[PDB]
Design a protein around this ligand. Sequence first.
Ligand SMILES: CC(F)(F)COc1cccc(-c2c(F)c(F)c(NC(=O)c3c(O)nn4ccccc34)c(F)c2F)c1
Ligand SMILES: Cc1cc2nc3c(=O)[nH]c(=O)nc-3n(C[C@H](O)[C@H](O)[C@H](O)COP(=O)(O)O)c2cc1C
Ligand SMILES: O=C(O)c1cc(=O)[nH]c(=O)[nH]1
Length: 366
Amino acid sequence: ATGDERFYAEHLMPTLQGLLDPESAHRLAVRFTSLGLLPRARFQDSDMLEVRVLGHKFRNPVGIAAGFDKHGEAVDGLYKMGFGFVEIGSVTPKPQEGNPRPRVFRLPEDQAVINRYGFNSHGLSVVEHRLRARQQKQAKLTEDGLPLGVNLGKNKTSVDAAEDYAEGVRVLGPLADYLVVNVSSPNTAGLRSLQGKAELRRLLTKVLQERDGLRRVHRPAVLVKIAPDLTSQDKEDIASVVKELGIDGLIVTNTTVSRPAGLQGALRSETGGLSGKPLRDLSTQTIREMYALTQGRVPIIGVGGVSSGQDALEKIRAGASLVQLYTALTFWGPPVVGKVKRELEALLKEQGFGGVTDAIGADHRR
Ligand SMILES: CC(F)(F)COc1cccc(-c2c(F)c(F)c(NC(=O)c3c(O)nn4ccccc34)c(F)c2F)c1
Ligand SMILES: Cc1cc2nc3c(=O)[nH]c(=O)nc-3n(C[C@H](O)[C@H](O)[C@H](O)COP(=O)(O)O)c2cc1C
Ligand SMILES: O=C(O)c1cc(=O)[nH]c(=O)[nH]1
């Protein structure tokens, strides 16, 4: 536990949260990061943390989830933070404003956040030109094991969900190492209910067909991102379509519209998606079903309440080849990346794993 770690957690972070509403704090976090105002990442990634999945090297499995850098403004500062991969978005075809403020709320007693941004996005065009300005720098980064994922969404007013997702595949597909069809946002009318078996099958057919129309070196992988609120019927059906259509992987899982017993924050009854520790195990259990339903054959990026190596390692052993975090960064600050990696590596060694790859799905073999 470094000096940066304890300093950012016990002093810097609680002071910023004391002066700043969460949306303001988010906006500043992005600026600082875009400018590279960040502490030294004194963790040097080891060979044990290397993962080869989705036709790519990841030099560590700890990524920043979608929603932090919605518009592509701080990608390089996030690699410098120490993440092994970066996912930007959600991006919607047309620019849109999102929900009226206030739309973000802290539950500090729960290590939790509730948000209803409602897909505030600069739009495909602005993000496309943003990413084009660094497209070749990113080609090198990918080669070095730091890939880039782009998360796609649809417009509030949009009439045909699949045409929104196809536009995104066409415009930002050539710039991404993987694309994410986000059919799980709680904050858009109709979006989570983008799994009507044959509905989801039709949407994902048009996405994969669009993706295959791109030139070989600009063909990303395509993932689906699902909610932790799914019935057992829904998960069985998602598993079925994913294997039928050859979907390249699953991101598990977006925030929850549930409110687990025991939440203590005053703001717990705010409308929106809950993230952080109340999501952790509900997240880990969805990795676990999805892995089993797909016979461990569909890569999974696990996400939900990860703030430590134990949290990351439980998700990997439950099926994840990669993990993401977001909420933990808003309490710990940048040092949380090095902290999770350092702890992940130590646990891998004590539990007898040769590396991350040996531990993927390990719980399903005990
Ligand atoms: C030189 C230096 F010392 F300044 C280096 O400091 C840094 C460097 C880099 C980043 C940060 C930084 C920060 F300033 C923050 F305000 C936040 N807070 C939030 O993002 C936040 C929150 O609070 N609620 N919330 C709810 C929803 C979404 C986001 C958030 C943060 F996550 C940060 F990572 C600080
Ligand atoms: C403020 C905020 C904004 C988010 N925006 C998006 C988004 O645009 N697209 C998406 O797929 N997930 C979004 N998420 C969900 C996260 O990507 C993630 O799935 C879940 O919050 C992360 O688990 P964790 O925050 O507990 O680490 C957002 C989450 C928060 C807290
Ligand atoms: O933009 C949002 O409000 C949003 C999107 C999403 O996928 N998840 C979330 O928690 N919020």
